[PDB]
C-alpha cells in the first residue's frame, strides 16, 4: 500500500556517464541492410540512410554505438568493408549463415553516426584475426595520415581521422557457438597483447576487454579474473552481457528478474576488485555492459529460418515484437544501471535498428515505428543526466514463483545540478496493486512539481506497431508535493518520472 523513500542530495553514488545511454549495431539480419542503410528508398538521404530512422535515433539521443559486432565481427575482415565500393567482395557470415555485401563498412557506418548525434564504438576481429590487423585498423581510424593505412582512409575519401576513443577487444569469445572460441588464458593474453599494442598507436583510446557471454557459462566469473589478470594495466573497462525472457508467461518472476542483474553487476564489479587488489592497482576497472535487453520472442521463428535455408541476405532475424511488460523490465534495468553509475560507464541497449529493438522498419518497406521497450529508454537518457543519489528506500515485498523478497518498488533519483532538477525513476511491480510513494525530499529547497510521466497499460501483453503505437507516455498524473515530501501514487504495473524543479 504505501512505499517510503528519502532523497538526500549530499547521499551521492556517483555522476551519471552519458555513455550507459549506448547501443549497438551489429551487421546481423536487417540492423543494416533493409534497416538504418536503404539506397534506393524515398525516405533515404545521399548516402541511403533512412532519414526517419535517422530522427527516431537522435530521439532516443544515443551517445555510443557499439559497431559491428557481436558474433559477425569474430570473422570479419574490415579491409572488405572499405575502399571502392565495387571492389568489396561478398562474404560469408558464419555468424549468422547470411552473406554480407559489405556496402556499409567503416566510412559509411562512421557517417551515419555522425548524422545521428553518435561516436562508434569499434571492435576487433580477435576470432580468426590477431594483435596486427587491429593495429592496421586503428591506425586507418586515428592516425591522421602519412603511413600506410592512414593514407589509406584518406584516399578512401575521409581526409579528417575519425579518433574513435573506445574500442572493444573482440566479441565474447567463451561460447561453442562462436567462430574463433578461446580459453580464457588464450584470450587474456591476446587481449593484453593487442591492448598493449593499440595503446602504442594511439594511447588516448580506451579499450574494453570481453567478459563472459552470459553469467550462466560455467568459466563466469574465473574467465573474467583471469582476462584481468594478463591485461589489467592496458584495459580501462570489463563487458558484461545480459537477456532477459519471458516463455515461462510468468510477469511477477518476469519483473523480479533486475534483482538478478543487480547481483550480476556486484558479482563482476567484486572480480575486479579482487583483480585490483592483486595488482596493487590504484586504478579501477569500469563495467562496460555492452548487451542488454530483454530478447525471447523471435526464438521460434529464428529457429525456422535456418533451418532451410540460406546465405541469405538480410533475413528477418531477431526480430521481438516487444510487449508493455517488456517495457516495465527494460525500465527496471535502466535503473538497476543507474543504480551502479558508480561502475557502469557505458552500457548498450542490444540492439538499436530491427534486430531486438526499440526501432523497426518493416520490410521492402518500410515502414518505421517505436516499438513499446522506446520509451523507458528515451526517458532514461533524457533525464537521467546528472548525478545519482543513493536509494534509501522502503517498499512493501512480494515473493514470486523463482525469486523471494523482491520490493514492489524500485527507484532511483537522479539530481542536475546544472538544470536544478530531481527525477525520479520508479516501478512497481506488482501488481496487483496500486502503492503509493512518499518521498522525503531533504535538501531542495524552494522547489516545486514539474511533471509526472507515466507508462501505463490494461494489457501488459499489448503491442505497437507500423499502425501504433498503444504504449506512448501520457502525461498524467497524481502527486502532490507540499513541505519537501513528494507523495505519488503509482499504477498497478507501471513505470514513473516525476520531476522536480
Same mark, same amino acid.
Given at each position: 500500500?504505501? $512505499?517510503?523513500?528519502? /532523497? ?16 549497438? /549495431?551489429? #551487421?546481423?539480419?536487417? !540492423? ?77 557506418? $562512421? ?6 548525434? !553518435?561516436?562508434? =564504438?569499434? $571492435? ?5 584475426? %590477431?594483435?596486427?590487423? !587491429? ?9 591522421? %595520415? %602519412? ?9 578512401? *575519401?575521409v581526409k579528417e581521422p575519425h579518433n574513435i576513443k573506445v574500442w572493444c577487444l573482440g566479441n565474447a =569469445?567463451? @561460447? ?11 584470450? *587474456? ?10 595503446? =602504442? ?29 594478463? !591485461? ?8 558484461? #552481457? ?63 529460418? =535456418? ?22 523490465? /527494460? %525500465? ?7 543504480? #551502479? $553509475? ?23 518497406? *518500410? ?18 543526466? @546528472? ?55 531533504? *535538501? ?58
Amino acid at each position: 500500500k504505501k $512505499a517510503r523513500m528519502t /532523497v538526500d542530495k549530499d547521499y551521492k553514488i556517483a555522476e551519471i556517464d552519458k555513455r550507459i545511454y549506448g547501443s549497438f /549495431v551489429e #551487421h546481423l539480419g536487417r !540492423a543494416v541492410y533493409d534497416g538504418l542503410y536503404q539506397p534506393g528508398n524515398s525516405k533515404s538521404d545521399e548516402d541511403g540512410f533512412r532519414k526517419d530512422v535517422i530522427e527516431l535515433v537522435k530521439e532516443l539521443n544515443v551517445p555510443i554505438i557499439r559497431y559491428p559486432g557481436g558474433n559477425f565481427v569474430s570473422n570479419y575482415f574490415w579491409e572488405d568493408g572499405v575502399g571502392p565500393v565495387e571492389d568489396r567482395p561478398r562474404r560469408l557470415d558464419l555468424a549468422w549463415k547470411s552473406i554480407e555485401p559489405n556496402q556499409v563498412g567503416i566510412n559509411e557506418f $562512421a557517417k551515419w553516426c555522425k548524422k545521428v548525434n !553518435a561516436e562508434i =564504438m569499434m $571492435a576487433v576481429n580477435l576470432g580468426t584475426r %590477431g594483435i596486427s590487423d !587491429a593495429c592496421n585498423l586503428l591506425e586507418y581510424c586515428n592516425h591522421p %595520415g %602519412g603511413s600506410k593505412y592512414s593514407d589509406m582512409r584518406i584516399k578512401h *575519401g575521409v581526409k579528417e581521422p575519425h579518433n574513435i576513443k573506445v574500442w572493444c577487444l573482440g566479441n565474447a =569469445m567463451d @561460447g561453442p557457438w562462436q567462430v574463433g572460441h578461446k580459453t580464457m588464458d588464450e584470450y *587474456g593474453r591476446i587481449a593484453e597483447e593487442t591492448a598493449r599494442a593499440m595503446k =602504442m598507436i594511439d594511447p588516448s583510446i580506451e579499450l574494453v576487454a570481453c567478459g563472459s557471454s552470459s553469467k550462466d557459462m560455467p568459466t563466469f566469473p574465473q574467465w573474467e579474473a583471469t582476462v584481468l589478470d594478463y !591485461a589489467y594495466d592496458y584495459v580501462d573497462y570489463i563487458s558484461l #552481457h545480459q537477456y532477459y525472457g519471458n516463455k515461462e508467461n510468468d510477469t511477477a518472476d518476469f519483473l523480479a528478474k533486475s534483482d538478478d542483474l543487480d547481483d550480476f553487476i556486484r558479482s563482476v564489479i567484486a572480480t575486479c576488485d579482487y583483480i585490483k587488489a592483486k595488482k596493487r592497482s590504484k586504478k579501477d576497472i569500469y563495467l562496460s555492459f555492452d548487451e542488454w535487453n530483454v530478447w525471447y520472442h523471435s526464438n521460434n521463428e529464428d529457429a525456422n529460418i =535456418m533451418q532451410n535455408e540460406p546465405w541469405r541476405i538480410a533475413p528477418p532475424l531477431l526480430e521481438d515484437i516487444y510487449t508493455f511488460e517488456d517495457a516495465l523490465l /527494460v %525500465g527496471l534495468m535502466l535503473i538497476t544501471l543507474m543504480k #551502479h $553509475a558508480d561502475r557502469i560507464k557505458i552500457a548498450c541497449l542490444a540492439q538499436l535498428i530491427n534486430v531486438i529493438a526499440p526501432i523497426v522498419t518493416e520490410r521492402n518497406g *518500410g515502414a518505421a515505428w517505436r516499438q513499446t521497450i522506446f520509451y523507458p529508454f528515451m526517458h532514461a537518457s533524457k533525464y537521467g543526466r @546528472g548525478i545519482v543519489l543513493q536509494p534509501v528506500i522502503n517498499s512493501p515485498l512480494h515473493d514470486t514463483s523463482k525469486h523471494e523478497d523482491v520490493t514492489d518498488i524500485e527507484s532511483v533519483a537522479i539530481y542536475n545540478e546544472e538544470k536544478e532538477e530531481v527525477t525520479i525513476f520508479a516501478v512497481n511491480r506488482n501488481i496487483h496493486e496500486d502503492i503509493v510513494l512518499v518521498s522525503d525530499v531533504r *535538501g531542495m529547497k524552494d522547489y516545486r512539481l514539474l511533471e509526472h510521466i507515466v507508462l501505463e497499460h490494461q494489457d501488459l501483453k499489448i503491442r505497437n506497431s507500423v499502425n501504433g503505437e498503444e504504449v506512448y507516455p501520457k502525461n498524467s498524473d497524481k502527486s502532490s508535493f507540499d513541505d519537501g515530501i513528494l507523495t505519488s501514487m503509482l499504477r498497478r504495473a507501471s513505470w514513473n518520472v516525476i520531476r522536480i524543479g
